[PDB]
Amino acid sequence: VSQVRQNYHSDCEAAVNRMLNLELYASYTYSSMYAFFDRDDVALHNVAEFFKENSHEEREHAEKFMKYQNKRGGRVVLQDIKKPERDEWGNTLEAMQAALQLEKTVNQALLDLHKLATDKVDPHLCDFLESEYLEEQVKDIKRIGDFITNLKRLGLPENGMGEYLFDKHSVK
Amino acid sequence: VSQVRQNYHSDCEAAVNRMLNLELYASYTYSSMYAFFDRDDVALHNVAEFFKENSHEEREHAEKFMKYQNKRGGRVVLQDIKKPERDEWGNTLEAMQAALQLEKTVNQALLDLHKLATDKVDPHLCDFLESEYLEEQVKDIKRIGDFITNLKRLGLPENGMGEYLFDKHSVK
Amino acid sequence: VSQVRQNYHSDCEAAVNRMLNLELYASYTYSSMYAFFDRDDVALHNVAEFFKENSHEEREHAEKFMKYQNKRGGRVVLQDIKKPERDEWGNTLEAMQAALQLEKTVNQALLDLHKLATDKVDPHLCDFLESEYLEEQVKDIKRIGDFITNLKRLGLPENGMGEYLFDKHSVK
Amino acid sequence: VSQVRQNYHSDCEAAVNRMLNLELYASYTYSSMYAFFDRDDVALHNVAEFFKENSHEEREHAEKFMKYQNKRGGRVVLQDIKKPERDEWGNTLEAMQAALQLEKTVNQALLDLHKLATDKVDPHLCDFLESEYLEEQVKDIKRIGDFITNLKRLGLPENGMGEYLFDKHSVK
Ligand SMILES: [Cl-]
Ligand SMILES: [Cl-]
Ligand SMILES: [Cl-]
Ligand SMILES: [Cl-]
Ligand SMILES: [Cl-]
Ligand SMILES: [Cl-]
Ligand SMILES: [Cl-]
Ligand SMILES: [Cl-]
Ligand SMILES: [Cl-]
Ligand SMILES: [Cl-]
Ligand SMILES: [Cl-]
Ligand SMILES: [Cl-]
Ligand SMILES: [Cl-]
Ligand SMILES: [Cl-]
Ligand SMILES: [Cl-]
Ligand SMILES: [Cl-]
Ligand SMILES: [Cl-]
Ligand SMILES: [Cl-]
Ligand SMILES: [Cl-]
Ligand SMILES: [Cl-]
Ligand SMILES: [Cl-]
Ligand SMILES: [Cl-]
Ligand SMILES: [Cl-]
Ligand SMILES: [Cl-]
Ligand SMILES: [Cl-]
Ligand SMILES: [Fe+2]
Ligand SMILES: [Fe+2]
Ligand SMILES: [Fe+2]
Ligand SMILES: [Fe+2]
Ligand SMILES: [Fe+2]
Ligand SMILES: [Fe+2]
Ligand SMILES: [Fe+2]
Ligand SMILES: [Fe+2]
Ligand SMILES: [Fe+2]
Ligand SMILES: [Fe+2]
Ligand SMILES: [Fe+2]
Ligand SMILES: [Fe+2]
Ligand SMILES: [Fe+2]
Ligand SMILES: [Fe+2]
Ligand SMILES: [Fe+2]
Ligand SMILES: [Mg+2]
Ligand SMILES: [Mg+2]
Ligand SMILES: [Mg+2]
Ligand SMILES: [Mg+2]
Ligand SMILES: [Mg+2]
Ligand SMILES: [Mg+2]
Ligand SMILES: [Mg+2]
Ligand SMILES: [Mg+2]
Ligand SMILES: [Mg+2]
Ligand SMILES: [Mg+2]
Ligand SMILES: [Mg+2]
Ligand SMILES: [Mg+2]
Ligand SMILES: [Mg+2]
Ligand SMILES: [Mg+2]
Ligand SMILES: [Mg+2]
Ligand SMILES: [Mg+2]
Ligand SMILES: [Mg+2]
Ligand SMILES: [Mg+2]
Ligand SMILES: [Mg+2]
Ligand SMILES: [Mg+2]
Ligand SMILES: [Mg+2]
Ligand SMILES: [Mg+2]
Ligand SMILES: [Mg+2]
Ligand SMILES: [Mg+2]
C-alpha cells in the first residue's frame, strides 16, 4: 500500500532486504581482514588497505539497496550483521581465497535475485542488478583470482619474501 | 521491407507508436498544469515551472521514440493528442495526485511494452526501455510521492500557508 | 605477547573491543533512521541525510578503535552487530529523542572505559578517549538536544508544518 | 624561588632532567646506527637515513624538555651523554630489535614520569607528556614492530636478498 509501489512483488522486496544484509556481512568480513593485516605481527599495510577499501565498497552496495527498496515502495527491514567466519585470516593467500569465496557467494545471491526478478517480470529490478552489481562482481572476482594465481606463483604460503613482494608490487 | 529492419516485430512497431502518443498526452497534461498554476488566481510560480519542465521532458521522451522507430526500420504513425482530463487542477495536492497517477499510467504502458518486447525476443527494445525510460519513471514516481507526503503534512488542501511554504521550499 | 605491547591491560583490550561493537551498533541505528526518513511516506530528505552522515561518523569511530587496538598490541575481536531497537522511527522528534539516548549510551560507555583506563594507569588510552571521542560526544549531544528543543517549539509531533519547517531550515 | 614557579614539584623537575638525558642517549644510539649502516661493508643507505632522522627527532625531544623545564621555572641540569651499548649493530634486524627495546625504554621512562606527575597533582606536566610524547612513542613502537615482522618474513638475518629488498621498498 505504498503510493509509489508498482510491479514490485513482495518476494522481491524480502529478497532485497536479505541481499543488503549479505552486503553488510561482506563489508564486515573485509573489515576483519583489514584489522588482521594491520596487526604488528602481520604488518602488510597495502593488503590491509585493499581490504579496508573493499569493506567500504560493500557498505555502499548495502546503502544502494536501501535507497532502491524505498524508491520501489518496499520497506527496509534490518537484521543482525553476523560476525565473520574467522577471527584471524592466516596470510595473504588464505585471505584472498576467503575473499574469492565471499565474492562468489555474494554473486550467487545477486544472480538468484535476478532470477526471482525475472520470474516476477520485474525489468526495473533486473536492470538495477545488471547495471549496478553484476558487472562489478565479475570484475572483483577476476581481480581476486588473478591475485591468487600470483600469490601461488610467489610461493605462498611458505615464501615470506614472495608475500612481501606481492604487498609491495601488486596492491601498492 | 525496410532495408535496416531486423528482429523487429510488427506488434512492437505499433506499440511504440502508441507509447509515443501517450508521452505526448502526458506532455500536454503537464502543459495544462503549468498554465493553471500560472493563473493570477492560483499564482504558484515554482509549481507552475515544475510542471512546465515535466511537459518538456515528456515531449523529449516522445521524440526519442520517433528516433527509435526509424532506427529499427519501423514507421512513425501519429494520432491526435487528446486534451487533458481536466481544464483546472484544484491546488498543488490535487495536481500532484493527478501527476502521480499519470506517471504510473505511463510506467504501466512502458512495462507492458517491455513484456511485449520480451515475448517477441527483442533485446534491443528491452535494453532501450530499461536504459532510457524505466529508471527515470521510478525516480519521477518517487519524487511525486515524496511531494504528496509533504503536501499532506503541510495540511493541504485547507492549509494555504502550507501550500505557500511548499512552493517556496520544495520546488524552489 | 605482542612485541609492541606495553602498559596495556587485558581488561582495557577487551573493553576496547566492546566499545567498537557499540560504535558499529550506533552506526547501524543511524542507518535505519536514514532509511526511514527516505521512505516515500515519510519523505524528510534533509533529516534522512543527517542520520546517514551520523552513520558514517560512527563507522569511522569503530575503525579508529580497530587501529588503536593494533597500535597497542591488542587483538581485534568482533561480535555480531545487533539490529536496531526499532524498525520504524515515528517522526523527526521521536528519532531525535532516540538519537539523544543512543549518544548518551555511547558517551557512558566511553566514560566507563576512561575510568577503567584511569584505574589501570593507562594515560595513552585516557588521552586517546579525551582527544578523539569525549569532546565530539559532548558536541553531538548538545546538537541533538538543541534540535529536540526546536522540534518541541515547532509543535511536534502533531504539527506537520513545524516538522516540514525544521527539515527545511535546521538541517538544510 | 623562580618567580614563575607554580605547582611544580622538585621531584618532577629532577625527573624532567633525567628524561631529557635519556632522549639525548636515545639520539646518540640512533646516530651510531646511522654511521654503521653507512659503512662501505654494510651499505644500506635508506636504513642509515631512517636512523639518522630518528637521531634528530630524539634531539628535538630533548630540546623540548629543556624549554619545558624553563617554562615551569625549573632548572636544566645536564649530565654526560653515555655512548651507545654497541659499537656495531650486526644487520637491519638486530638494529631494529635494539631500536624497539630503546623505544620501549624511553616509553617506560615517560610513563613513569606521567605517574609521578599524577602523584604530585601536576596536570600541566601530564598534558605535556600526553600531547607531545606518549602518542609519538606508541606510533614509533608500532612502526618498528611492523618492520621487525617484515624483516623476519624476509628471512633475516641469513637472507641478504631479503635485507636488500627491505632497504629498497620499506624505508625508501
Ligand atoms: Cl506492486
Ligand atoms: Cl506481491
Ligand atoms: Cl524482509
Ligand atoms: Cl541466527
Ligand atoms: Cl579464527
Ligand atoms: Cl563465503
Ligand atoms: Cl524484422
Ligand atoms: Cl512482424
Ligand atoms: Cl501504429
Ligand atoms: Cl477517440
Ligand atoms: Cl475541469
Ligand atoms: Cl492517468
Ligand atoms: Cl519559512
Ligand atoms: Cl602490557
Ligand atoms: Cl593484563
Ligand atoms: Cl574481547
Ligand atoms: Cl545476544
Ligand atoms: Cl518498530
Ligand atoms: Cl540507547
Ligand atoms: Cl612550586
Ligand atoms: Cl617541591
Ligand atoms: Cl637534576
Ligand atoms: Cl656512570
Ligand atoms: Cl659492539
Ligand atoms: Cl634499551
Ligand atoms: Fe558487494
Ligand atoms: Fe564485490
Ligand atoms: Fe569492487
Ligand atoms: Fe515520459
Ligand atoms: Fe516521467
Ligand atoms: Fe523525469
Ligand atoms: Fe523559509
Ligand atoms: Fe561514536
Ligand atoms: Fe588526564
Ligand atoms: Fe589532553
Ligand atoms: Fe556521536
Ligand atoms: Fe559527531
Ligand atoms: Fe624520544
Ligand atoms: Fe620515539
Ligand atoms: Fe618518532
Ligand atoms: Mg498511503
Ligand atoms: Mg511482503
Ligand atoms: Mg543472508
Ligand atoms: Mg553467532
Ligand atoms: Mg554496466
Ligand atoms: Mg587486472
Ligand atoms: Mg527498399
Ligand atoms: Mg505492422
Ligand atoms: Mg494510448
Ligand atoms: Mg475528446
Ligand atoms: Mg540506467
Ligand atoms: Mg528526493
Ligand atoms: Mg612474537
Ligand atoms: Mg586479554
Ligand atoms: Mg556492547
Ligand atoms: Mg536479536
Ligand atoms: Mg580536543
Ligand atoms: Mg549549534
Ligand atoms: Mg627572584
Ligand atoms: Mg629540587
Ligand atoms: Mg637516565
Ligand atoms: Mg662508560
Ligand atoms: Mg595527541
Ligand atoms: Mg605503518
- Distance CA(A136)–CA(D68), nearest Å, equals 56
Q: CB contact, 8 Å: B165 with chain A?
A: no
Residue B130 grid cell: 530499461
- Distance CA(B9)–CA(B15), nearest Å, equals 10
Provide the β-strand partners of residue C81: A81
Report H helices in chain A: 10-37, 45-72, 92-119, 123-129, 135-153, 160-169
Domains of chain A, earliest start first: 1-172 (1.20.1260.10)
- Distance CA(D59)–CA(D52), nearest Å, equals 11
Q: Are the C-beta atoms of B153 and B145 separated by less than 8 Å? A: no
How many other β-carbons are positioned within 10 Å of the β-carbon of residue C119? 11
Q: What is the 3-state secondary structure (H, E, C) of chain C?
A: CCCCCCCCCHHHHHHHHHHHHHHHHHHHHHHHHHHHHCCCCCCCHHHHHHHHHHHHHHHHHHHHHHHHHHHHCCCCCCCCECCCCCCCCCCHHHHHHHHHHHHHHHHHHHHHHHHHHHHCCCHHHHHHHHHHHHHHHHHHHHHHHHHHHHHHHCCCCCCHHHHHHHHHHCCC
Ligand 7 centroid, distance to B6 Cα (angstroms): 4
DSSP states along D5-30: --S--HHHHHHHHHHHHHHHHHHHHH
Q: Is residue C14 packed enough to be buried (19+ CB in 10 Å), middle (13-18) or exposed (0-12)?
A: middle
Q: CB contact, 8 Å: A43 with chain C?
A: no
Q: Is the dihedral of CA C15, C17, C23, C26 positive or negative?
A: negative
Q: How many residues does chain C have?
A: 172
Q: Is the dihedral of CA C34, C36, C40, C41 positive or negative?
A: negative
Name residue C111's amino acid: L
Q: Is residue C164 packed enough to be buried (19+ CB in 10 Å), middle (13-18) or exposed (0-12)?
A: buried
Ligand 10 centroid, distance to B87 Cα (angstroms): 18
Q: Are the C-beta atoms of C3 and C59 separated by less than 8 Å? A: no
Ligand 54 centroid, distance to B168 Cα (angstroms): 59
Q: Residue D16: name the closest of D118, D110, D136 by CA.
A: D110
For this experimental structure, what is the resolution in angstroms?
1.6
Between the two ends of chain D, the Cα-to-Cα distance in Å is 51
- Distance CA(D163)–CA(D169), nearest Å, equals 10
* Cβ contact B154–C165 (<8 Å): no
Q: How many residues does chain B have?
A: 172
Residues in B touching A8 (Cβ below 8 Å): none
Q: CB contact, 8 Å: B138 with chain C?
A: no
Name residue C41's amino acid: D
Report H helices in D38-171: 45-72, 92-119, 123-129, 135-153, 160-169
- Distance CA(B129)–CA(B23), nearest Å, equals 13
Scanning the structure block, which residue is given the C-alpha cell 589501570? C120
Chains B and A touch (3+ CB pairs under 8 A): yes
Q: What is the DSSP letter of A87?
A: S
DSSP states along A129-147: HIIIIIHHHHHHHHHHHHH
B119-124, Cβ contacts within 8 angstroms, sequence gap of 24 or more: B120/B9, B120/B11, B120/B12, B121/B7, B122/B7, B122/B8, B122/B9, B122/B12, B124/B7, B124/B72
Instruction: Report the gap between the CA of B1 and the closest CA in chain A (Å).
Output: 31
3-state secondary structure of A81: strand
Q: Residue C24: name the closest of A66, A14, A50, A82 by CA.
A: A82
Backbone angles phi, psi at C81, to 5 degrees: -95, 110
* Cβ contact A123–B107 (<8 Å): no
How many other β-carbons are positioned within 10 Å of the β-carbon of residue B63? 13
- Distance CA(B163)–CA(B154), nearest Å, equals 7
* Cβ contact D134–C123 (<8 Å): yes
Scanning the structure block, which residue is given the C-alpha cell 532506427? B71
Q: What is the DSSP letter of B133?
A: I
Instruction: Report the gap between the CA of C71 and the closest CA in chain D (Å).
Output: 6
Q: Are the C-beta atoms of B96 and B144 separated by less than 8 Å? A: yes
* Cβ contact B159–C161 (<8 Å): yes
Q: Are the C-beta atoms of D107 and C6 separated by less than 8 Å? A: yes
Ligand 61 centroid, distance to A49 Cα (angstroms): 40
